[PDB]
Amino acid sequence: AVQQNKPTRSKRGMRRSHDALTAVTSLSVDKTSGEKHLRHHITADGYYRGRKVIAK
Amino acid sequence: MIGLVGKKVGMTRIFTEDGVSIPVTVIEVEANRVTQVKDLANDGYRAIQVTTGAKKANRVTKPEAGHFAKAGVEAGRGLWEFRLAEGEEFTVGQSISVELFADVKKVDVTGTSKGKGFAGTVKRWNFRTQDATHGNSLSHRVPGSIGQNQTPGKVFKGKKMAGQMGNERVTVQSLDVVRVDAERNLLLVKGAVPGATGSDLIVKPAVKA
Amino acid sequence: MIQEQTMLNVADNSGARRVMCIKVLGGSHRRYAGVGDIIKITIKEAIPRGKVKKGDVLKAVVVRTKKGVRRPDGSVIRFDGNACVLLNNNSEQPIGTRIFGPVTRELRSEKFMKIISLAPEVL
Amino acid sequence: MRHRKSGRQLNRNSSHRQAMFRNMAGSLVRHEIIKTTLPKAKELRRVVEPLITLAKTDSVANRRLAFARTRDNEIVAKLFNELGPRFASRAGGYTRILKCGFRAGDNAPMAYIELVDR
Amino acid sequence: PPHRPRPRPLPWFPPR
């Protein structure tokens, strides 16, 4: 099964009207390190909810 | 006649002395509290709104809390309306118990059926399967033809096809009331009713009778 | 749970040994016959000098099934085999004079009281 | 439908799943902290925590059960000599899962799972 | 009667 007519650039754009990404609503700030992090995830320096939880 | 809101507790059996096992659904019917009364003057129809159960105060939004506050009833887990027959009367704040069903022989029970998700035509519509063997190519449970030819050159509305099954409102009519235990807040009805254990049920006196 | 093509033993002394159900009577598209139901049968195996002959087409009542019968308290009675009693095609009365093996109380009716009375055991 | 069913399949057959969690449970007991995917970490809790529970009550039978479920004498010896005692007065919850980013290769959500007294 | 032969295959040709 295949198109009988070439779809327009208009229709292409309409289909892609739902393809947009969502930015991360809000990042959190660790209360000790001050680093930004995804909520409920550890920071890059291994902090979570103030506590140093992992090395590196 | 008004109904009550209850909760499907589960199924069991009642043995009778004459040696019959009656399959029963156990419906827990706590006090239904009237939250609002609707009348012709203001609303254009007669009905009561009832709540039942409980709700943690922090889960009750301010709009909901204000509604319960006006009635002067504790917040329940939801609101349900029942249309009033011409004879009936109720007041805001009033409790209605399962004693309501004391003399009722048959009830209708409305619930949300269990959710089967996306179901095929075999399960959803009892379509017959095609041959398992004798050369069938990739078409064992598929629906077969879905229309005619150039006339009408379309598929008719309401064609039975795969789709969401269950997780919808279902009423089972004319179930026998086996027992009404006011003290335990229990209604026993004979037979199965819609929904999973724990689900809300609406119980009304049977319309057919 | 007897259907067309099901082979049954015979629980009587009609002379038949094996019979085959060729029709479940009593409704359009009726699928199954259980204990107490009338079926149309053909005789597949018969004793030399019996009241019935191989190839005869008559009726029978199912008296024992492997699927069994449920009772009002939820109990079940299952038998090791399927068995029927041959009936006259018109009168629907037993052909044999003796019943072999147990039968159930599902037969307790004006129609099959002769079978009940002749049966060595009723469950 | 999977109403009320427990257990993740994790795109493996049963024998592979069992082998993997046996290995992973060994890793966690040895290292006390490992990085894995978040669903694997969530499933691992259901394997390791019963092992630690078993190790609280030291007996020949329990050591043999643990061996049957780990197939590593070093792991059994550590369960019964170190971890059992360490968790003697803890009613479950021997592990914690800490979510930590996405894997470069395949964007899998990753987590650390560690013993809580590490 | 039939108005068409039962479908058949074509011989391979260098495609591009």
Place this chain on the structure above:
Amino acid sequence: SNIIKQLEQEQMKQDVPSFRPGDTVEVKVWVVEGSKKRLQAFEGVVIAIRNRGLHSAFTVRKISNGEGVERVFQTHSPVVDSISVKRRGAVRKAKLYYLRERTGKAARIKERLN
């Protein structure tokens, strides 16, 4: 679960004797031939037990008038008047369905001597 537990408990018989698969039991059941109630005995080997509170059942097999018969009894049914163990059988398995394909000497169960 307390609600259904309570409903179930109030219907349960308190006088159910202990029995195991492989036991020979006699079950007395009420039979109603019109007005007259009477007890009919069913004696056989217990080949299966379903323990499930009020929903407990047991299956008894016998050979009757040339015919194998199984009856599944609902243990707490009022239809069942009484149960009595006539002989204690020695078997390994919970369910003795393998007896269905056995007859005579082969279907014999050793007695549980204690």
Place this chain on the structure above:
RNA sequence: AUGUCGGCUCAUCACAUCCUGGGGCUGAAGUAGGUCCCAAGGGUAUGGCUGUUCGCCAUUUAAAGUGGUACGCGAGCUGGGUUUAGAACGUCGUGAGACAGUUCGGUCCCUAUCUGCCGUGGGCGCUGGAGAACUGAGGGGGGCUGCUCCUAGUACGAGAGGACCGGAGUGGACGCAUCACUGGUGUUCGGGUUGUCAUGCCAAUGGCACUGCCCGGUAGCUAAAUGCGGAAGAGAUAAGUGCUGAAAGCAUCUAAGCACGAAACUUGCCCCGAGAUGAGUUCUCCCUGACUCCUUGAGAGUCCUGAAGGAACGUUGAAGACGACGACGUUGAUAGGCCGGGUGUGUAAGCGCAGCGAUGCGUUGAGCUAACCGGUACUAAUGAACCGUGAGGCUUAACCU
């Protein structure tokens, strides 16, 4: 290049009606028919033979309707028949070959753009915002029927036989729900066992051999399991039956007027449903700053403010393709663990005793036990932050000042 018979799957309409419903006439006593009128709501066999459609036959059924839909339906299946290439028979032909014929064999492609259809979301709208509960325009589903008993061996009839009307019971087929029971499944639970490899060895275990092969089986899902349904009633009618009644001193169901009258129609039952843009109703909740400029208006901008609520995130669910929907987030049982129970399996391991040994016995209904039940903050569900604003146009009426 518009794929062709039949089958399968899935249908949908007509009515010239097969059944069921209503009725007139009968060469209609009754029962049972004949015939014609009205009626399309629902229903409307399984097999043997054959490629068959058909047909014949067997046995059912209330009935096994007739047609239209590309002789409905191959981008849905089949490929038996029939239009390829092989081969043979009869026949025709000197022959190549051929057939008012026959016979054996013989590749069925397509990831769906658009319409359509089944489901399920996102956007914006609905005139301040928000959370709920509704009304119900409108739409869809459903609508089958047997047998027995009572009425009554009554009415009818010389007998034989044998009712209407009305009532009760129990079935078949179909549909909906459900898992208490009976069962299936149950590669996540327990056990038995063959071969082999390993854990130093013994003992005990694990891997692999379709889950190695098996026996049981929890929860869930489920049918063969077991609950429930089709209606009554009402309105307006069909054919039909009438009442009163002239035109036409009579007669006349009809012209005026009035009454009955069917599974059809409109309701009544079930479900969807306010994008019903004709965007409805009810209840509740929230927001009561300052200033500047301009082409002066439903204008723009700055600062302050950020509510109700929402969303995100996290723990998740008998909710689920994803979205969505539901629960819960420490003021906490949302999930996992843990504790207790239940259930399943069937008396673990170790030790002791007996036996030459295989093994048995005792400790012991032992040990282990998934998805179940009841508890329990041990682990994970964060302080925040994000979106959403700051009293809501004009006109006209009425009522208040």
Place this chain on the structure above:
RNA sequence: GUAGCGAAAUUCCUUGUCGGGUAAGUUCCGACCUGCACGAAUGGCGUAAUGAUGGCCAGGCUGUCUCCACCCGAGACUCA
């Protein structure tokens, strides 16, 4: 047109007729002869054994089916 064979890999009429098998058999087996249009090395008729050969019947067996249910994997679906 002999022997032999014959509704046949051949028989149009034709599902011929009779018998057997099935509850029911346009196929099958045994016959009949009315051979449309068999027939003697483009061999006739038989034939043990053999056949991934054609037709038919029976036992066993079964999800082929009545009528499907559940489960395990690989895809489908979501993310990179």
Place this chain on the structure above:
RNA sequence: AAACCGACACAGGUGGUCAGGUAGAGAAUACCAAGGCGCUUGAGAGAACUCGGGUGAAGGAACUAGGCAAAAUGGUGCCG
């Protein structure tokens, strides 16, 4: 065989030699040795439907053009 023949780092093809252990008649087959590898997208999810499998109450060819497919049988010794 990713280096040869197959347009490809392609389920294909490619002559000769070597051949351990336990079970086994065996170079079959299962599990292993020496030795060699996990197949150059992954992660989740646990719908329909498709593919490849497992089990199935009662019935047992009723399926179908046709038992197609599946299920079944399956070894050795002795008797027969």
Place this chain on the structure above:
RNA sequence: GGACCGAACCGACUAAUGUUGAAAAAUUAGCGGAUGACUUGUGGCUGGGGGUGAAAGGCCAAUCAAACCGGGAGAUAGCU
């Protein structure tokens, strides 16, 4: 022993899959032959109205009722 059962090896009867394939003929499960009119390596010979053919108009480099390449050649085309 053109004997039997059965691997290697040689074949290719059935089914499913695949059909913009993993593959311009395969994969999976079954299947036939398997001391012979067997199978296979290396090299050689037969040439296009010619070869070769246990005969299918089969095969002669994925091409066959007359190979492929170049030429006559811009054949001819009352046809599109």
